[PDB]
Amino acid sequence: GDASLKSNLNKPNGLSYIGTVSSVSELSSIAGLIGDSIILDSYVDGFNLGGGVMVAVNSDTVVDNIVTFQGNGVVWKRKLFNGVADVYEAGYTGTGDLAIFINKINAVGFDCIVPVSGEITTPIIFDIAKGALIGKNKCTLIESASATGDYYLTIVNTDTDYTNRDVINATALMTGVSFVGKGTRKLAIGGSTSGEVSELRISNCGFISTAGIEFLDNAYRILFDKCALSRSFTNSVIFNSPANSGEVIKFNHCWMVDNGGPFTFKNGQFIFDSCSLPA
Amino acid sequence: GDASLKSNLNKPNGLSYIGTVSSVSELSSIAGLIGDSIILDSYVDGFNLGGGVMVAVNSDTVVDNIVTFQGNGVVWKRKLFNGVADVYEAGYTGTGDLAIFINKINAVGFDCIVPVSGEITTPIIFDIAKGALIGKNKCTLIESASATGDYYLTIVNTDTDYTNRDVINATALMTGVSFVGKGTRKLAIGGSTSGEVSELRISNCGFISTAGIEFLDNAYRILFDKCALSRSFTNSVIFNSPANSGEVIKFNHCWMVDNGGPFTFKNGQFIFDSCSLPA
């Protein structure tokens, strides 16, 4: 009856009488009119992570599976999105490969916020033309035993245009992330097919027990702003005179101890400022 | 019937059966009791931006059109506002003059978060006594062709009190914004009527194709922390010996290339640290 329904809705738990969408996978079958608002419990069923109020927009809306999602005759967009994308909104559940969701957010064109620690397996591709990489809550990325390849993280710039270079690189930022490797995989900066990776601030980051940092082509004027590069295996820094690379590479207040591999500076221009090494 | 209504509310899209307020303009005519909660779809009708759950507060509450909004016999306040104001919450719809909403948020006294790129036309007045200016997601502000005046951004401090100077200037911050001018307008720091603009960190910012950076009265110890100042027209930096200005002005890891105007240092004390120029 109406009296029971009205009374149930007015109870302190009255919201529990409104239906919800359990997951993003279910969202693809939910139809609606433009402007309809629905409750999304979670990205993945039962995890209570990455949900929110969704609103129906035109079916031609670009779907990024972070803010906008496929619907049945519409697209569902986060109604109250503040512009800041985190890995929970991209589908991370607290287990599995965190690198998948770091790659996904950056590939869409948002800053990637990682407010959680976890394990990484697939190599990370961090494109400074598409956003920043921001760790929070002591963000620690621990490489899994099964992780393969020569690189756990490669920093690129898919923008090869001159006009956009200064615009893109001025804001380039990676901050607040500690990587715990197993001594087999490196961090790469640049690439022969990459645009110029320059004016990148890498601040408050740890690179512990990795296989080193390797500079590729088109990588210069990188600013390591208070970072740790310690306990490295086989190599610490690799600069094997790559083309269009090496100008004013600066380590500011960096802590580099207990490493098990050389700093190979074949050409290039390197600045250590208030650093400590090697212990 | 009652069973149809109850089951519709319990459907996965059950929230769509709850009414909503379409815009802030409509919100002005919405009445309610103190504590009533309503759904705001958007600041401007149909854009799905800047909405949220609103709660009715006392009718004498100060309305700032960011957190609090006028109602019919009450004031509507953002129920879940966390203190962080973005341009969407101030009325930005994805097009138009972003400078209007930067000015509005700063004038009220919040940090202004700009998680989007767009155009600027009206001159920005950035008061460091009121909050910071923070760009996200490769924030790029492109000056419109119709923008007039000599300045696109002026950085001031309306607090002229000595006691508050150190308190205010310690946290002064502008970060993460690339300004792309058309060669006609400058950036001004200070002013004869301004309080002392000092200890300001300008980090990860771009000043590209502008008419230069001009120091006015009461501007000193500015820290340009990894910025681009490139492709300038007519002037790059103007320091025409202004009064109470010039102490330890530092460019840290700055990219200053392809400029078309001089760095005029008539008096003053300037520090270039790990900069590159002029190409």
Side-chain angles (χ1 to χ4, degrees):
Chain A
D2 289 316
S4 288
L5 176 61
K6 189 183 310 177
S7 183
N8 285 343
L9 292 171
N10 200 35
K11 284 162 53 192
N13 70 324
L15 181 63
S16 55
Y17 296 87
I18 309 296
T20 63
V21 179
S22 296
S23 66
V24 163
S25 57
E26 183 185 359
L27 198 52
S28 62
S29 65
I30 307 302
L33 303 178
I34 299 299
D36 283 6
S37 297
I38 68 184
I39 299 174
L40 176 69
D41 293 325
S42 181
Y43 198 118
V44 180
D45 181 76
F47 282 98
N48 299 316
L49 290 173
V53 182
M54 315 295 293
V55 61
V57 299
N58 196 286
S59 52
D60 69 2
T61 305
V62 164
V63 168
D64 58 20
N65 289 322
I66 304 171
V67 182
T68 50
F69 300 84
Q70 182 65 53
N72 183 14
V74 295
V75 164
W76 295 104
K77 171 168 173 287
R78 295 186 182 276
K79 189 190 188 77
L80 312 176
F81 184 63
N82 63 0
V84 179
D86 59 60
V87 292
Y88 292 135
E89 296 166 319
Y92 183 61
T93 64
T95 185
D97 194 352
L98 245 181
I100 289 177
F101 306 96
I102 295 174
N103 286 344
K104 169 182 174 183
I105 295 177
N106 180 262
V108 160
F110 291 102
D111 296 336
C112 175
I113 280 70
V114 191
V116 65
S117 299
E119 296 193 25
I120 57 174
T121 301
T122 182
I124 303 175
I125 295 178
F126 173 46
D127 182 3
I128 67 175
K130 298 188 178 173
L133 183 57
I134 302 174
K136 302 180 183 295
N137 299 319
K138 312 300 301 181
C139 175
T140 302
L141 305 182
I142 302 177
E143 174 168 315
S144 69
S146 57
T148 59
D150 296 330
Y151 304 96
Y152 67 92
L153 166 62
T154 302
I155 306 183
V156 304
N157 179 6
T158 52
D159 204 319
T160 62
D161 172 64
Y162 161 80
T163 303
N164 295 331
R165 180 198 59 195
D166 292 5
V167 180
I168 284 304
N169 294 12
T171 61
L173 175 68
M174 168 170 100
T175 187
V177 179
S178 282
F179 297 88
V180 177
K182 59 168 184 292
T184 57
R185 304 201 301 179
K186 289 171 293 181
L187 194 165
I189 306 180
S192 56
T193 67
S194 166
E196 288 182 358
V197 178
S198 60
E199 320 308 326
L200 166 68
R201 187 195 301 271
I202 299 173
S203 65
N204 314 323
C205 286
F207 311 100
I208 316 301
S209 301
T210 71
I213 298 175
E214 180 175 11
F215 289 89
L216 306 178
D217 293 359
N218 307 307
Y220 62 96
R221 293 190 43 83
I222 308 301
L223 174 59
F224 296 90
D225 188 2
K226 201 207 74 65
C227 295
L229 176 60
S230 302
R231 314 188 64 87
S232 306
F233 291 76
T234 313
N235 289 285
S236 295
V237 172
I238 303 174
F239 190 90
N240 192 9
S241 187
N244 197 36
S245 299
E247 181 180 358
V248 195
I249 293 169
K250 178 172 165 180
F251 308 100
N252 176 65
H253 202 81
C254 286
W255 169 258
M256 301 174 162
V257 298
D258 301 327
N259 286 307
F263 295 72
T264 301
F265 293 165
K266 185 180 172 67
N267 291 316
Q269 174 190 19
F270 297 91
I271 308 289
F272 293 85
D273 195 350
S274 83
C275 300
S276 289
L277 48 78
Chain B
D2 176 61
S4 180
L5 176 61
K6 182 182 180 184
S7 67
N8 280 344
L9 291 171
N10 199 40
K11 280 163 52 192
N13 64 326
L15 182 63
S16 58
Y17 296 89
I18 309 297
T20 62
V21 178
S22 278
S23 67
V24 163
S25 180
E26 185 190 347
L27 190 54
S28 59
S29 67
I30 307 301
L33 303 173
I34 301 293
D36 282 359
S37 301
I38 60 101
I39 300 174
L40 178 67
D41 293 323
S42 180
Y43 196 117
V44 182
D45 178 68
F47 284 97
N48 299 316
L49 293 173
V53 183
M54 316 294 296
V55 58
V57 296
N58 199 290
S59 63
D60 62 6
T61 305
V62 170
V63 172
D64 60 10
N65 296 131
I66 303 176
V67 186
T68 48
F69 300 85
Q70 184 58 55
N72 185 12
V74 295
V75 171
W76 293 103
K77 177 167 177 287
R78 295 189 181 276
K79 185 189 193 76
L80 309 178
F81 184 63
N82 62 3
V84 181
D86 60 66
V87 292
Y88 296 137
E89 297 171 315
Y92 183 64
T93 63
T95 63
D97 193 355
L98 259 171
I100 291 175
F101 307 95
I102 296 172
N103 289 343
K104 170 178 173 180
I105 295 180
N106 182 258
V108 169
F110 292 103
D111 295 339
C112 179
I113 282 72
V114 189
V116 67
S117 294
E119 60 104 332
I120 53 173
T121 299
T122 187
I124 305 176
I125 299 184
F126 174 48
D127 184 1
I128 64 172
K130 298 289 183 63
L133 179 54
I134 303 171
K136 300 181 182 296
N137 302 315
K138 315 300 302 179
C139 175
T140 301
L141 302 182
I142 300 176
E143 172 167 317
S144 71
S146 56
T148 57
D150 297 331
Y151 303 95
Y152 67 93
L153 166 63
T154 304
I155 305 181
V156 303
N157 180 6
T158 53
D159 201 318
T160 62
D161 173 66
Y162 160 83
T163 306
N164 296 329
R165 179 198 60 195
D166 291 8
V167 182
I168 282 171
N169 293 13
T171 61
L173 177 66
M174 175 176 72
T175 187
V177 179
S178 283
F179 299 89
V180 182
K182 61 171 181 295
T184 54
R185 303 202 299 180
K186 295 171 292 182
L187 194 165
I189 306 182
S192 57
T193 61
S194 167
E196 291 185 0
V197 175
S198 56
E199 324 303 334
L200 164 65
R201 188 195 298 273
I202 302 174
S203 60
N204 313 326
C205 281
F207 310 102
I208 300 159
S209 300
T210 71
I213 296 175
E214 182 173 12
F215 289 89
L216 304 180
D217 291 356
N218 308 308
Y220 61 94
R221 292 189 42 84
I222 309 298
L223 175 56
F224 297 89
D225 191 8
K226 201 208 74 69
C227 296
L229 174 63
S230 60
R231 310 172 195 174
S232 304
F233 290 75
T234 312
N235 290 283
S236 296
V237 171
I238 305 175
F239 188 89
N240 188 24
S241 186
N244 196 29
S245 298
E247 179 180 355
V248 192
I249 296 172
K250 179 174 170 177
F251 306 103
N252 178 64
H253 202 80
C254 286
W255 174 250
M256 297 167 148
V257 302
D258 305 330
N259 284 308
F263 295 70
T264 303
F265 296 163
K266 184 178 175 179
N267 294 319
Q269 174 187 24
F270 299 89
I271 308 292
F272 293 82
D273 198 347
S274 78
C275 299
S276 287
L277 51 75

